[PDB]
Amino acid sequence: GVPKNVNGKHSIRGDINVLLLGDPGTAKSQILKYVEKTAHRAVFATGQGASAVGLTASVRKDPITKEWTLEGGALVLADKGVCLIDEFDKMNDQDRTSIHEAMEQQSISISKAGIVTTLQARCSIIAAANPNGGRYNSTLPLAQNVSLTEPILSRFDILCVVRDLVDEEADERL
Amino acid sequence: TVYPLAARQMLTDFDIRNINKLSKKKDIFDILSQSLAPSIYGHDHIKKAILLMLMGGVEKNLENGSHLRGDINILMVGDPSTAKSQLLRFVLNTASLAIATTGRGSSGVGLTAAVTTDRETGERRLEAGAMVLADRGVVCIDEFDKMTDVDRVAIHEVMEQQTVTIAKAGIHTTLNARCSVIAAANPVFGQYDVNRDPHQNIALPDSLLSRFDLLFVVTDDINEIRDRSISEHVLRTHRYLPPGYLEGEPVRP
Amino acid sequence: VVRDDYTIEAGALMLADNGICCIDEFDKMDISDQVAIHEAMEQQTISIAKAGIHATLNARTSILAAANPVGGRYNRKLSLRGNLNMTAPIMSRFDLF
Amino acid sequence: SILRIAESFAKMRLSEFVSSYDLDRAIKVVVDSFVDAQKVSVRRQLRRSFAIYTLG
Amino acid sequence: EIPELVPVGEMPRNLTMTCDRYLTNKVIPGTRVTIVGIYSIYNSKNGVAIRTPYIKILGIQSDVETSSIWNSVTMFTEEEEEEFLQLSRNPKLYEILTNSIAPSIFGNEDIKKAIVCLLMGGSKKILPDGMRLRGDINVLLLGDPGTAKSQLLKFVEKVSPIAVYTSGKGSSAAGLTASVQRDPMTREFYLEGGAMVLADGGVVCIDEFDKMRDEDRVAIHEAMEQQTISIAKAGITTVLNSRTSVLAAANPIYGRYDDLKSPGDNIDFQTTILSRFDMIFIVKDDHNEERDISIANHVINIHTGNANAMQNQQEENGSEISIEKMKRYITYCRLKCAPRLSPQAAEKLSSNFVTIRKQLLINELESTERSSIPITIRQLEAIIRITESLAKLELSPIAQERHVDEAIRLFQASTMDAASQLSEIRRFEQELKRRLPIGWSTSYQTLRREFVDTHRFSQLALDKALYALEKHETIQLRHQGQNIYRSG
Amino acid sequence: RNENFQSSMSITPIKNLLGRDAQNFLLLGLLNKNFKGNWSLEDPSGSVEIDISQTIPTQGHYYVPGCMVLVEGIYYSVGNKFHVTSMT
């Protein structure tokens, strides 16, 4: 969409974040790789390999003069692009949901090691998650199907539920 | 020239006459107790212990070398807004030498001593931390229930030994610290329990509880009459105007 | 990631590039190893974004694993899913048993 | 989110103004996501509840 | 550089600049400034032909920054001072300041009043015994997502003259408070100020306060309450002053605030940090169709651009003021007015405090466990500071009783509303549904003499279950609360 | 405005009474029967429950609910009640 600035007083996020919840074997990750091929700027992260400060942004001590300098995270490298998370549910909660300010305020506010900085991270986040138990239950609601909580689910604009249903003819054409 | 700016105030003979006149009174302990912090209501025995803390007891050094501590130390544990930190600020202001410290604003090396180079010498030397610079004085510890364990080691070392041994950077030195400690703490829960559980008083180990002479515990029990008395007392406190200043201007028995 | 400023140490999946990674005691593998294998079989990449360093690492690797059943020997009455500690997606990621 | 999905649908056509068709498609996407998120006991009722907004 | 004008995918670049003579000591760190000057090159002691650039400052201008280093000095011009006096003489400046805060956020009127009270602040007082009492209020907005709490944080950071915006995840103990760093050339430790040093005399805003670490939350207690940071690290011990008003936003531990769930389960904060906070605003979503349609129309008018027209027209109407005028009015009201209390106001304040503590007895009787939201003497000091800020809106040196009841209304709307969140109940419900039929009424004295004097139940069971039948809307109350009428 | 109160006692608002245990006070209150069915006195600052066991009323007057009466007596903080000595 379009980010909006109202009178220099109000800010409206313009990017769209999409969560794909589905059964395994439904090609959720190939779409993410296609967005990596397709988007102008595209950053990838998955699992326990994405830290809380691997995303967002971090701070570090330089070997020269031992001064605290900022380091751009995964969301800094997607300032006008797409950040893509694979296996979103199995990632740690501290590592899952450290991205609230980039996915809501489109900004990275940092106050550590004597450094205060309001970075811009206008990120479209495309996540790919799995239901509880490995398979989606059609008779259950969405809330206990996911391990995600209400605020991390609430920012996501489109939540695509995929169910691997056995069909005599859809499997044929597929 | 250098001026101290009077930590050890000079004593005129009129002051000595006043001191020896008031010493003969039977309730000089009460007068000097409620003379400490009239803005603070309650905690009268705590202020009596504060008075006996500022004039700490005599120290006796035996012939065999046992160091018998004459410095009384006080740990105040209890509910929020029971004015423990305000008593810490008062004994900070009214002492001859007072050094404050905080649970998350202290390091164990930063409390005793740190080794650093000197600019005009090009030689390594010690600079004393918080707990050594307050020698023959008081240390005002706030949020004592949440030290890092490294700072707990150094603090417990001073409470059991009164001297710190530094063996690093080619330096083998001992430093004396004959100082008093007043500290404030909250229980391990959000509010203090009236279930008198020994383990949920403080989160610190009982070994550090043992070196504190007076473990005062305060409960902000919810009342009507005494609560109204405290309410009217703090509204009398807020209605004070400092002398020589205009009404409604910012501040610059 | 290794402080030396972080650098990458390759894991045993990466050293078996265009080859075979024979893994023993596959049942009691770690959860970080689980979620890295969850991307490592199909997409053949491991993506690491930690602190200042972010990258994707291509690991074309064919996996041969030998996993003991947990809780003792294999039970012939139970299903093959019951005897193993693996979940559904990493079982579906394997070619054959 | 409906407003950004309508703006993105207008952006896909390279048209600087958003039409009512883009609002209809954005509402259709958001309603379809909400219906697919719901449990199957009430997907028929929820589909018939919002059918007047998407189809017309 | 300005964060609004950074390039894509890069970092803001620090550039070294110099001032000489009377241009020195004019700016506090953290301000936004426009600078005119020459772009010269100087050789540095630190490859080939690399000569580091700098800017020699010829001129400094900043509307957000005033009075250089703060000396409580009146540098406002005379006609602007007369205009500010006219604003202080306005009979409804309270609604003007309420509507000035968040014009593009529907509802949250009590939150806007608490924000204006935070921006004006209380009065710092000095006692002869060294007793320093707080002159700032800290407000925590706890509630569901989608209530625009972080937008209120951003607007508070825009309106306030000294303000910083921080995170809960992006924070640290040495980041919010002052840090101990090392100089490279001298190899000596020195203290560099953090986010609560850059916000000294102003507002610090914290986003996602529920998520900041347990060792990270508790370095703030002396900086919220004692208005100082006492640091004894690396051979340096000092007590820096940090007079920061704290505005924090948070969600509950569960994903949304659930009215069915107990308030103890939703909040895993300690009672200490809620004792330090002054407005504990718990906000919920009731899903009222009128409120949903009103917020829908308001956000539609914001997105289409018609809200730009409505705020631009209402500014010329005179019921709202902009960021710059309200910022300078905040600075003038903090630098000019510091009010006391009338003796008749103290009776009302102490009486309301003992009344709400007696209500806290009733709140903590039947639950038998301690409430997570406490009302202590520091909350009485909070209501005192609210009253003094309400006097500081209109430059009133005396906080009269008219400001006192509004302070009581704000405290009941925030903290008392937050704190108010087997066989006897069913047996009472069956006996009362069989006792009085549909469409007939019964006096409360009849129920008192037949259900308490009989000792069929307790009086607390009666008082709870009458409310329980009231919220079920099958049995309601009529005729000044003295009649119980079955609606049926 | 009357000379008796410009002398005898002074009027305290009702909200200030709760907290003052066992002290004599003189009041002006709107007389009312509350939801509980007991007698109460009300001002714009609040209300208090009273009991009329020990009253010595002024002879020559009428007392009905809705009267604004001068009430002299002692407040007790045990049950939140006000024991009235005299009413006029």
Ligand SMILES: Nc1ncnc2c1ncn2[C@@H]1O[C@H](COP(=O)(O)OP(=O)(O)O)[C@@H](O)[C@H]1O
């Ligand atoms: N139309 C399709 N539907 C489902 N799966 C497909 C389709 N086309 C290809 N695939 C297969 O899906 C696999 C990738 O699935 P992946 O996204 O890794 O599963 P998961 O969603 O569990 O991560 C590919 O190996 C590909 O062969």
Ligand SMILES: Nc1ncnc2c1ncn2[C@@H]1O[C@H](COP(=O)(O)OP(=O)(O)O)[C@@H](O)[C@H]1O
């Ligand atoms: N007379 C009094 N009685 C009780 N509490 C008071 C009194 N005067 C001030 N206080 C409150 O005590 C508080 C300080 O205690 P606190 O900061 O909670 O100590 P700590 O930081 O050790 O927990 C102040 O906020 C002040 O409002």
Ligand SMILES: Nc1ncnc2c1ncn2[C@@H]1O[C@H](COP(=O)(O)OP(=O)(O)O)[C@@H](O)[C@H]1O
């Ligand atoms: N009353 C309102 N008026 C305008 N916009 C609103 C309102 N309520 C919510 N919003 C929008 O919804 C979003 C809510 O985000 P917010 O609740 O501030 O995040 P957090 O849950 O972290 O506090 C904002 O981006 C805002 O634009």
